[PDB]
Design a protein around this ligand. Structure first.
Ligand SMILES: COC(=O)N[C@H](C(=O)NN(CCC[C@@]1(O)Cc2ccc(cc2)C/C=C\CNC(=O)[C@H](C(C)C)NC1=O)Cc1ccc(Br)cc1)C(C)(C)C
Ligand SMILES: [Cl-]
Ligand SMILES: [Cl-]
Ligand SMILES: [Cl-]
Lengths: 99, 99
């Protein structure tokens, strides 16, 4: 699609058998979701943004579907104020900024 | 231009006659810059990011060039980890997301 930026670019994602809303963020290195369960190994990470850092669990090789498009990558889970889809997954669905 | 996301979408901006680097961030409502001097009066704003809240100085109607594209709008100045260009100015330069 072509997604306007008059409003927040929120889309539906499918992950771990759940449907969720998340924000497409070209400025984010990583994808970070509010608390949820995911299968497999994880390790702890600290990630920084405006306001400082939060501790999250890093899960690798997680399948996800974003706006209909399948990808696989690293998903971080923790006390983020909002679900964010970062560049690690945006690249996989062919997302570009255009102007 | 068309900017892919395999690296951070860092571009050159010009503000107050000076060049700076800033990140194009579709996840950001607002544009937040690192400490700098701007003209006129400012108003308070509290903005929230992944790590919590910060206090910034809001300046309105500031001219800013982004990748050579002229904009004039609201710039927040405060203790941000990086210069971020948010949707308030991305809409002025005709940016969309495409995949
Ligand atoms: C409506 O309120 C907002 O618009 N607030 C914006 C904001 O914070 N938007 N949030 C998206 C992520 C922003 C950002 O891309 C910004 C950023 C980019 C690069 C770097 C730091 C910060 C560089 C350093 C480290 C890399 N670090 C990230 O790459 C991190 C990732 C690990 C999530 N990236 C980010 O944190 C969503 C959000 C929304 C509501 C609330 Br309450 C909290 C979060 C703000 C404060 C920038 C205007
Ligand atoms: Cl990844
Ligand atoms: Cl590509
Ligand atoms: Cl503005």
């Amino acid at each position: 699609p072509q997604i306007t930026l008059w409003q927040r670019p929120l889309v539906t994602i499918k992950i771990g058998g759940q449907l969720k809303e998340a924000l497409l963020d070209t400025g984010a290195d990583d994808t970070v979701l509010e608390e949820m369960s995911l299968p497999g190994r994880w390790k702890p990470k600290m990630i920084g943004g405006i306001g400082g850092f939060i501790k999250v669990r890093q899960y690798d090789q997680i399948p996800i579907e974003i706006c209909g498009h399948k990808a696989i990558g690293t998903v971080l889970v923790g006390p983020t104020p909002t679900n964010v889809i970062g560049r690690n997954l945006l690249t996989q669905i062919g997302c570009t900024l255009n102007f």
